[PDB]
Design a protein around this nucleic acid. Structure first.
Lengths: 72, 127, 55, 61, 189, 32, 144, 125
RNA sequence: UGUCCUACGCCGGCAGGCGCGGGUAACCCGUUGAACCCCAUUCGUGAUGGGGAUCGGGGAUUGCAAUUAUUCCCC
């Protein structure tokens, strides 16, 4: 029915993100938003933050689609 | 980042509810009398980060933005940008927001009904 | 003027040109003007003997 | 069983609206058998078909 | 070596089905840098068998009105689809593309005939050209109607549909519609 | 080619020739 | 040997020139910088708060690429598509006062001057500054 | 020594001048690698990639492009550069290289040297 | 296509206003700097930043005259 995606990081959500996102083999805003039940703009912000800390590898950048994946 | 300890899910301003889980520049537009343009200009005069969400504003921020929307002319918001420019009874420039919009609307309808012009008579004959 | 077809004839606008495209058109070649044109490119009863009937 | 077979001769356009093609088909695994089939789509000489039930031979007037 | 998008090779591309070697044109003469060619592959019959197959996907994602004529968007879509399918699967994207094309084309169709009131269905075979065409159409429809109102983009849904039809798992749209068509063909011999 | 497209091509090539060949007040008095 | 404006990426050049004109800080910023839409076909105010420096950088680049542009030419350049309600869309120009204020601010910085045959055009010193920032773009991008 | 050729598309025209040089490619005074649509960038870059940068290392070209749209201009540009190189290796370089290069272009793409004569149809009352 | 098409300068946030030039025209608008398209930002499945109808206030413009909203602009 009506989705109730979180607008901001909860504590358990942030911890689960930080220790379960960096092993997915495919990192896009859509997959994190759908399987973490979060708003996609904050999904993009979280992915940008994980890229900023040097832990996730960007593959290609676009205005339409951005894709990341694991370092190793 | 993470949720602040004072994140307001529901705001109660101008006798109207605000959904706090939204960007501030549209949670302002959630009430009557303000759309996207006036909300952006109010927030730029108020010097508030528009990237920030609505639910994490402090009491000083909400009281100053409410203050600015009640008296926009004082805060160099121009005359042309306002909702009511020349009130017919008392000529002055203002911005009717929550209940004053409904007040001026229904009293304009009563004024058009009392004088029996075409517009008011047609509007009340429409129902 | 003296061609067969002109003599055997049943008797803004002038600036129009036609290129033609063969080797690629080299404009700097001295012999290029040969490939630039100035004009648009491109009843009796026979008897049984085969002699035509004129009237 | 899935059995594959090549077109040799298209016999013509059949069906009420001309929606099918009657065609002459020989098998590759045994290039002696010959069958007549109806196909949907554009078929020219050399097309190889995959038949799910290669026993019956189709027919239309 | 000619490479799709500068990083995808067509030398290791192996086509499995005997039926479609002349009708899936992606090899050393059909290898191109980009799925855009401005080609007139439809001015004569059977010319589109010489069209490279990524150009056929690119030509078949320009559907439903708004997207007509927008080919650069579609070249972008299939490019991002190739990157994401390579990341998710770990091998050559073009190989599972031709795998999903082979596994998505129906082998036995049904035709509707009728005389007056009586309308019945007769099972008929399919051309290889129609096999490839219907596989392309069903995959494009699967991706398009797969996303349409969700957070997932067009490229992710196209790549997921392409994987799900490459391995032939029943959660794919194209293999479901193909199985339905083959079932009604078997029931209408 | 036809008239219009060839005309555009000819003037374009002429302008390119002049811009390749490319790379003070008027004479107000008669005698120096 | 010196790289020109026409030798680099235009978007990075425009952003670097915007940073240059922002750090100079001597353009005459209008008093109505945060309360206007840039054309009648817009729907919102510009999202980047110091849009004036970006617009002035792009304006300077556009005069470099083609001289003799007045206010009307720059309104034609930044014009777009007005969606007329339930009615068919059309092409609409930009706002004249914004282009005029950008041109007059660039004249006040002495980067841009009039000519005898028409509108605004580039000064030689502003052209030196523009070649300098173009070389900075090429060094920051093509040498990296 | 220099040659001047042209290529075309629906309405887009490209005029290419080919002179002795060192391997810099100019279109409308702008470099080849900066023309706006990157999605068609390899469509702009196919003659160089097929022939190698070593065949362009002793030549320079400047192309003026007028008419058409983005894609039509790109196709006219690639036709122009291919015809310019063919004309140059025909006129001032030996013919065998010109023929083998012409064969390479025409086996990869006929529209690199033969114009597509498709245009919009007219509507009659 | 154009003696109403318009370059340019100044004012106003916009419609618009003032002045001064070209064009009876491949000569000036006009190298017709069109939109889709392309590249970055915000948005995140929400009758929601989709969609704009219908209304309230004010300004401007064409007309002898805009009321039953001529047309345009802003909220």
């Amino acid at each position: 029915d009506k989705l109730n995606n979180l607008v901001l990081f909860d504590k358990a959500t942030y911890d689960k993100l930080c220790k379960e996102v960096p092993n997915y083999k495919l990192i896009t805003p859509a997959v994190v938003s759908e399987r973490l039940k979060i708003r996609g703009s904050l999904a993009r912000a979280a992915l940008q933050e994980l890229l900023s800390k040097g832990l996730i590898k960007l593959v290609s950048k676009h205005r339409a689609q951005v894709i990341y994946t694991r370092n190793t | 980042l993470v949720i602040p300890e004072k994140f307001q899910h529901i705001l109660r301003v101008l006798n109207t509810n605000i959904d706090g889980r939204r960007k501030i520049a549209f949670a302002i537009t959630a009430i009557k009398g303000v759309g996207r343009r006036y909300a952006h200009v109010v927030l730029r005069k108020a010097d508030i980060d528009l990237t920030k969400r609505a639910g994490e504003l402090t009491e000083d921020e909400v009281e100053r933005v409410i203050t600015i929307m009640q008296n926009p002319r004082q805060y160099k918001i121009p005359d042309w940008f306002l909702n009511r420019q020349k009130d017919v009874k008392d000529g002055k420039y203002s911005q009717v927001l929550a209940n004053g919009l409904d007040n001026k609307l229904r009293e304009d309808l009563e004024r058009l009904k009392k004088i029996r012009a075409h517009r008011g008579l047609r509007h009340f004959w429409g129902l | 003027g003296d061609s067969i077809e002109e003599i055997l004839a049943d008797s803004r606008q002038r600036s129009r040109a036609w290129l033609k495209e063969d080797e690629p058109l080299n404009f700097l070649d001295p012999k290029v003007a040969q490939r630039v044109l100035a004009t648009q490119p491109g009843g009796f009863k026979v008897s049984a003997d085969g002699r035509l009937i004129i009237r | 069983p899935i059995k594959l077979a090549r077109v040799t001769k298209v016999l013509g356009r059949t069906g009420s609206q001309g929606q099918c093609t009657q065609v002459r088909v020989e098998f590759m695994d045994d290039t002696s058998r010959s069958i007549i089939r109806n196909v949907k789509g554009p078929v020219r000489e050399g097309d190889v078909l995959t038949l799910l039930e290669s026993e019956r031979e189709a027919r239309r007037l | 070596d000619i490479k799709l998008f500068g990083k995808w090779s067509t030398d290791d591309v192996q086509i499995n089905d005997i039926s479609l070697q002349d009708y899936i044109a992606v090899k050393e003469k059909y290898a191109k840098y980009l799925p855009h060619s401005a080609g007139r592959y439809a001015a004569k019959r059977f010319r589109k068998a010489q069209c490279p197959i990524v150009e056929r996907l690119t030509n078949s994602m320009m559907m439903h009105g708004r997207n007509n004529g927008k080919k650069l968007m579609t070249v972008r879509i299939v490019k991002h689809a190739f990157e994401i399918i390579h990341l998710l699967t770990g091998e050559n994207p073009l190989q599972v593309l031709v795998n999903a094309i082979i596994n998505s084309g129906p082998r036995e169709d049904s035709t509707r005939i009728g005389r007056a009131g009586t309308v019945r269905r007769q099972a008929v075979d399919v051309s290889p050209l129609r096999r490839v065409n219907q596989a392309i159409w069903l995959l494009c429809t699967g991706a398009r109607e797969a996303a349409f109102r969700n957070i997932k983009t067009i490229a992710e849904c196209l790549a997921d549909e392409l994987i799900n039809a490459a391995k032939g798992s029943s959660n794919s749209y194209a293999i479901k519609k193909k199985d339905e068509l083959e079932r009604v063909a078997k029931s209408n011999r | 080619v036809g008239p219009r497209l060839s005309r555009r091509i000819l003037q374009q090539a002429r302008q390119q020739q002049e811009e390749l060949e490319a790379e003070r007040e008027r004479t107000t008095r008669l005698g120096p | 040997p010196g790289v020109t404006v026409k030798d680099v990426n235009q978007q990075e050049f425009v952003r670097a020139l915007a940073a240059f004109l922002k750090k100079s800080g001597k353009l005459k910023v209008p008093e109505w910088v945060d309360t206007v839409k840039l054309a009648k076909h817009k729907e919102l105010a510009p999202y980047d708060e110091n849009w004036f420096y970006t617009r002035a950088a792009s304006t300077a680049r556009h005069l470099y690429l083609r001289g003799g542009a007045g206010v009307g030419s720059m309104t034609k350049i930044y014009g777009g598509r007005q969606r007329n309600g339930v009615m068919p869309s059309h092409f609409s120009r930009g706002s004249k006062s914004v282009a005029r204020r950008v041109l007059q601010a660039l004249e006040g910085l002495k980067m841009v001057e009039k000519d005898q045959d028409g509108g605004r055009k580039l000064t030689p010193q502003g052209q030196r500054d523009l070649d300098r920032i173009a070389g900075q773009v090429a060094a920051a991008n093509k040498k990296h | 020594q220099s040659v001047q050729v042209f290529g075309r598309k629906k309405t887009a025209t490209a005029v290419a001048h080919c002179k002795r040089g060192n391997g810099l490619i100019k279109v409308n005074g702008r470099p080849l690698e900066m023309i706006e649509p990157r999605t068609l960038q390899y469509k702009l870059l196919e003659p160089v990639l097929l022939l190698g940068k070593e065949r362009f290392a002793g030549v320079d070209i400047r192309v003026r492009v007028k008419g058409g749209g983005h894609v039509a201009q790109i196709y006219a540009i690639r036709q122009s550069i291919s015809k310019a190189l063919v004309a140059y290796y025909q006129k001032y370089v030996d013919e065998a290289s010109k023929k083998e290069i012409k064969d390479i272009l025409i086996q990869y793409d006929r529209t690199l040297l033969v114009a597509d004569p498709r245009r919009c149809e007219s509507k009659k009352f």
